[PDB]
Amino acid sequence: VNSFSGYLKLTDNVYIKNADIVEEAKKVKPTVVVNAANVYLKHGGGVAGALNKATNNAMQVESDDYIATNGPLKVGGSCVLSGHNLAKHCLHVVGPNVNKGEDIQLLKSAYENFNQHEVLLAPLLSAGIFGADPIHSLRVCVDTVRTNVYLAVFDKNLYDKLVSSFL
Ligand SMILES: O=C(O)C1Cc2ccccc2C1
């Protein structure tokens, strides 16, 4: 049994809810919240900007030190950093950004990072301002992630479209 409430069950392991991931993290304090990161961990906008704002910029301070030491992530890759006030840990995952021209086949590789964690609160990778089709992102998620994932979708209109169209 876990703390996640109000989710619709899509499969054995994937659950979905219309929710602000920031507000959901604040309530649940999950072991792992996923950030929709870029390779530079520059948390300017979208989910990353919102998560970072909720940490009072501490996520960005920590991230800048991580990049200064380790250099940029790979598209499709990830790193585990602090969850600050939102979660125990933040898994920063880089999905391909279609608005920068990145290979969408890298979306499966991005979701494979989730399999290293038993339970996660996450957004749809590459969706929103990353330019991918969120329906596609949800299909790759379900067909790739084997661990228990709680997907928070910010847009209500999109949530309803994702549920109604889910196979
Ligand atoms: O409505 C949503 O949940 C989308 C908003 C957003 C922004 C940047 C990255 C992913 C997503 C998912």
Curated annotation (Swiss-Prot):
This is Papain-like protease nsp3. May form homohexamers. Interacts with N protein. Inhibited in vitro by GRL-0617. Changing residue 31 to A: In strain: Mu/B.1.621. It comes from Severe acute respiratory syndrome coronavirus 2. Residues 1-167 form the Macro domain. It catalyses: Thiol-dependent hydrolysis of ester, thioester, amide, peptide and isopeptide bonds formed by the C-terminal Gly of ubiquitin (a 76-residue protein attached to proteins as an intracellular targeting signal). Responsible for the cleavages located at the N-terminus of the replicase polyprotein. Participates together with nsp4 in the assembly of virally-induced cytoplasmic double-membrane vesicles necessary for viral replication. Antagonizes innate immune induction of type I interferon by blocking the phosphorylation, dimerization and subsequent nuclear translocation of host IRF3. Also prevents host NF-kappa-B signaling. In addition, PL-PRO possesses a deubiquitinating/deISGylating activity and processes both 'Lys-48'- and 'Lys-63'-linked polyubiquitin chains from cellular substrates. It is a multi-pass membrane protein. It is found in: Host endoplasmic reticulum membrane.
